[PDB]
Amino acid sequence: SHMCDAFVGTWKLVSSENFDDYMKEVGVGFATRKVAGMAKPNMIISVNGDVITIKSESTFKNTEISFILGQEFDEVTADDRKVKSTITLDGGVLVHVQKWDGKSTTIKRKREDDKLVVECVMKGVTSTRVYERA
Numbered sequence: 001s002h003m004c005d006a007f008v009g010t011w012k013l014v015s016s017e018n019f020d021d022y023m024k025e026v027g028v029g030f031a032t033r034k035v036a037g038m039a040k041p042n043m044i045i046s047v048n049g050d051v052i053t054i055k056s057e058s059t060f061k062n063t064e065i066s067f068i069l070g071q072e073f074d075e076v077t078a079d080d081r082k083v084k085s086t087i088t089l090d091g092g093v094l095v096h097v098q099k100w101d102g103k104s105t106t107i108k109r110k111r112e113d114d115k116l117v118v119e120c121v122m123k124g125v126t127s128t129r130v131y132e133r134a
């Protein structure tokens with residue numbers, strides 16, 4: 001057993017708050033915000049050795065990242081930003097930092113009760129998204 005066991009599996013979005021405002025703060029344009037805000041993604045997390053894979057599947061986009069904790073990678077986000085990302089585990093929370101154009105956003109994923117809670121922060125704006133097991 002290991003590092004991310006309680007994250008592994010298939011998760012479905014059940015609530016969102018403040019996500020349009022988070023996307024505005026990131027710089028996402030109107031049409032992408034509307035369609036992405038409507039999305040109801042499933043998040044699929046798996047681990048093979050030291051490699052963690054996180055997929056987000058929705059009617060808007062299907063994305064996939066694979067990474068090693070603490071080891072930076074280049075990522076194309078669903079809104080087509082080219083970012084440099086690093087994901088670490090900090091006290092049981094997966095912390096995903098994206099850097100681009102002198103900007104930074106952090107996405108935190110944690111287990112709370114039977115939920116996987118996702119907190120997205122861009123300057124002073126936070127969005128909270130809650131997932132349950134599918």
Ligand SMILES: CC1(C)COC2(CC[C@@H](CC(=O)O)[C@H](Cc3ccccc3)C2)OC1
Nearest residue numbers: 036039041056058060077078079118120129
């Ligand atoms: C456009 C974005 C700025 C691109 O990056 C994210 C970062 C936070 C993610 C939060 C989560 O996993 O629920 C989110 C997932 C998602 C939402 C809607 C459609 C497809 C994927 C993707 O926010 C919207």
